Design a protein around this nucleic acid. Structure first.
Lengths: 48, 295, 168, 158
RNA sequence: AGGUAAAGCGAAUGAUUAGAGGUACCGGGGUUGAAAUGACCUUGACCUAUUCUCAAACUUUAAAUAUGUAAGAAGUCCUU
RNA sequence: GAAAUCUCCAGUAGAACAAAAGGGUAAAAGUCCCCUUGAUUUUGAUUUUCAGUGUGAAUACAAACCAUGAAAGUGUGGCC
RNA sequence: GGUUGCGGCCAUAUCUACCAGAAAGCACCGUUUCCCGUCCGAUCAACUGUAGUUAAGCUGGUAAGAGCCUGACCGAGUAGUGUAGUGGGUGACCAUACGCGAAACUCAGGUGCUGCAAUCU
């Protein structure tokens, strides 16, 4: 259900998440099925 | 051996009774029924007439209940009867009737029902309740309260009932616990009830001991003989006292004398004070150091 | 100092026990009526015993309460039979005393061939002013240790009055 | 045979308390209930009349009707694959006020004050509730606060 | 809102090992003048403070995980 | 007489409450004493098993008519 | 500040042992014609406030008191536990990773607050 809310329906899918206390608890539930970290003004430029 | 019931386990598993019960004051089994209001009325206060009898005094109150604490509407006392011309005999039937008729007229003046619902200004000793006037407001309903006092046929608690009823209030009641009520053939003897209102039962006892035992007639009734009060004068005292109450029943407080701070200054001289935690441990140092070498 | 702690006889309770039912009991009831003046009260059994020979709720024993000046006369009547000599038993820890007699022919009275012969159990409770503290309804409470009655204090009172002895 | 009574499996639920047996305090009876209030339910072992079924212990609902000694409370429950409306009739001894709605009324008055005050001065309110944000950068002073060097202890038998 | 996991028994309810003290008013066997309304023994009788181990149908205490309600125009206050 | 009846002191329930077991109750829901027939009438609404059908039981009112108490009240069978 | 009447929360308020209490109040206390109730004016009922008293109750203080109540980087991030691995081990069961987290125990401090009406060196 949480993966459905974060729009990661397919394998290999991106989004971006605004980091809060509430959004951090969602990532705890789905941590085995996802890898995540802090991007920079370089990786973001290439993706868009 | 022997018993040894009061151990550490007994004290830990002891439910204390509330406090009012622990003192020996209030009955909560009765008070649940008296205070609890019909919930379709929401916030209509339920008034109750408290009557108590200490030694050489009578107390009367009208009380409303809230969550924080009970609120008094108005209250009267038997030691205020000296203003209306009654000194001796403050714990009689006639004092309880006089105090009840005083209490009613205090509250009706605040609410504003003096002319309407006057009461009974004749008094033959009849069983009656205050009837509602057409095209107007109903009478002020007050329920009777007792507490931990016994209910018998001809007791001072039910004298104050009729005092409040004859005063003007709608206090609902029956006939079977007034004096002069025949137990076998259930009827009211109105002659015997009227005597207790005007100090009749006491004034008959004046006549008996006057002729017979003169030692008791000087032991009792010192104030009556000192202030020059004969047997037949008792009718005129309580009759004129009732008329004075129906005139100016307003409550006026005493002169008091000295301010509240002067009472506080005098009282704190005698009542003791606690120690600090350091002064407690100083006594322990003394008890150790005294009993270390032993003396 | 001692103004209020007078120490007095509060009540005297006579008791006559029997082991059967019916007619023997009704005779023993009228003995205490002549003794006291008051109509006595009849006790009854709690549970069935069989070995003594009484059922539960069979009704058997009788007793009567005595108070005031009338109690002090009947106490000295009983002590006249005992020669004013009670033992160092006959005294509770709380300081209440009693004694047993055989036959009501002593302490006044007569034979009276119809009614018969019976023994008694005398018992007297001792107290002080302010016993209403416990007995009243409104505001009940315990009594302080200085005001409580003891064995030694009651025996000292008993030697002073009545011209009597402790023996043991 | 299997047992399915009214008070089945209610050994600890309707058990009273530790050192709170006997009579109830009078504040329970004094409380007022108008049609609209939210209320949580707690069964009381001593009072046997107007007692709730075990399912409704800890449930919450709105009041729809009031009478002499009782209040009508509608509770929604799940069954099969569909919610159903149910009507209860419990006495005042079991019911107490809910503190969930309590905090909402505090927020309504405060937002009205902030909008009315700031419009005649600030021209910027920010009244929506913020989730707990991450940290901002700062500097920590080491003066009289020098780091204590730790190390993992060796194994011992207590 | 709850009475599971864990915890607890010098805290109720029930189970259970080992001495020490008080013995005292007392139930008892002896040994000492057949003696004991007397000692010292194993003693019970409990009591007093301690100590070893426990519990699906015992409990003061009490998690995690699940679970009920609320986060506003059908709103909040003023008037009649 | 270890056990009859009588009196005082300590006594958070270690008793009792028609039966199985659990919960509940101390100026009582236990024990004793006074008066009675709410184990009554007319019909619906509502919880529990649940197809949200019936059967059984139980809860909260309306209009009546009574009981009991100084009253407030309480009572439409058995404390649950 | 003391005290009475009706209370709210219902042990910081209870329980045990010893000392203190001016004034007013509360109490114990004194009597049995009348209503009343008992085996017994003890209890309840009526009567006097006169003959007496702080002895008890009630109120307050004392005690390295028992108990009850708050807190602590006291024990303890230990017991337990949601999630994950082609991790270990013959099994029994254990360790790591991302999270949540007790109770006994030990130490420190406290020991009734408060509402309405009346009264008082």
């Amino acid at each position: 259900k949480v993966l459905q809310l974060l729009r990661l329906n397919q394998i290999n899918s991106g989004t971006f998440v605004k980091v809060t206390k509430a959004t951090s608890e969602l990532l705890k539930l789905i941590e085995p099925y996802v890898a995540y970290g802090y991007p920079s003004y370089s990786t973001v430029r290439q993706l868009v | 051996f022997i018993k040894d019931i009061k151990t550490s386990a007994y004290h830990s598993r002891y439910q204390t009774p509330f406090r009012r019960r622990r003192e020996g004051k209030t009955d909560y089994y009765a008070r649940k029924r008296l205070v609890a209001q019909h919930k379709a009325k929401y916030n209509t206060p339920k008034y109750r007439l408290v009557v108590r009898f200490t030694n050489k005094d009578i107390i009367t109150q009208i009380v409303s209940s809230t969550i924080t604490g009970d609120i008094v509407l108005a209250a009267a006392y038997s030691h205020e009867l000296p203003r209306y011309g009654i000194t001796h005999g403050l714990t009689n039937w006639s004092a309880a009737y006089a105090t009840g008729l005083l209490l009613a007229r205090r509250t009706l003046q605040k609410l504003g029902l003096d002319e309407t619902y006057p009461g009974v200004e004749e008094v033959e000793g009849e069983y009656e309740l205050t009837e509602a006037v057409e095209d107007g407001p109903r009478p002020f309903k007050v329920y009777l309260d007792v507490g931990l006092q016994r209910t018998t046929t001809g007791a001072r608690i039910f004298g104050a009932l009729k005092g409040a009823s004859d005063g003007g209030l709608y206090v609902p009641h029956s006939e079977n616990r007034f004096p002069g009520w025949d137990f076998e053939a259930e009827e009211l003897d109105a002659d015997l009830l009227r005597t207790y209102i005007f100090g009749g039962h006491v004034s008959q006892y004046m006549e008996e001991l006057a002729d017979d035992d003169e030692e008791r007639y000087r032991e009792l009734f010192k104030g009556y003989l000192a202030d020059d009060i004969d047997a037949d004068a008792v009718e005129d005292i309580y009759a004129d006292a009732h008329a004075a109450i129906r005139e100016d029943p307003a409550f006026k407080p005493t002169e008091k004398k000295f301010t509240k701070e002067q009472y506080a200054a005098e009282s704190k001289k005698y009542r003791q004070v606690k120690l600090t935690r350091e002064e407690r441990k100083a006594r322990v140092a003394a008890k150790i150091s005294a009993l270390a070498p032993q003396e | 100092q001692n103004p209020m702690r007078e120490l007095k006889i509060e009540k005297l309770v006579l008791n006559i026990s029997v082991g059967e039912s019916g007619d023997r009991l009704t005779r023993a009831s009228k003995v205490l009526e002549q003794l006291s003046g008051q109509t006595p009260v009849q006790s009854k059994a709690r549970y069935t015993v069989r070995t003594f020979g009484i059922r539960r709720n069979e009704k058997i024993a009788v007793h009567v309460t005595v108070r005031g000046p009338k109690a002090e006369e009947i106490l000295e009547r009983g002590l006249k039979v005992k020669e004013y000599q009670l033992r160092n038993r006959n005294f509770s820890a709380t300081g209440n005393f009693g004694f047993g007699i055989q036959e009501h022919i002593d302490l006044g009275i007569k034979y009276d061939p119809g009614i018969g012969i019976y023994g008694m159990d005398f018992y007297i409770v001792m107290g002080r002013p302010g016993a209403r503290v416990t007995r009243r309804k409104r505001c009940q409470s315990k009594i302080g240790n200085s005001h409580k009655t003891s064995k030694e204090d009651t025996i000292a009172w008993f030697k002073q009055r009545y011209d009597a002895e402790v023996l043991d | 045979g299997k047992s399915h009574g009214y008070r089945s499996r209610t050994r600890y639920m309707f058990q009273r308390d530790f050192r709170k047996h006997g009579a109830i305090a009078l504040s329970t009876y004094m409380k007022v209930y108008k049609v609209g209030d939210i209320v949580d339910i707690k069964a009381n072992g001593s009072i046997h009349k107007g007692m709730p079924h075990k399912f409704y212990q800890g449930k919450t609902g709105v009041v729809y009707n009031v009478t002499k000694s009782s209040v009508g409370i509608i509770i929604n429950k799940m069954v099969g694959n569909r919610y159903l409306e149910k009507r209860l009739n419990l006495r005042v001894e079991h019911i107490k006020h809910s503190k969930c709605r309590q905090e909402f009324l505090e927020r309504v008055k405060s937002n009205a004050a902030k909008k009315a005050e700031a419009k005649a001065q600030g021209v910027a309110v920010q009244l929506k509730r913020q989730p707990a944000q991450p940290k901002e950068s700062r500097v920590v002073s080491t003066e009289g606060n020098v780091p204590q060097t730790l190390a993992p202890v060796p194994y011992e038998t207590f």
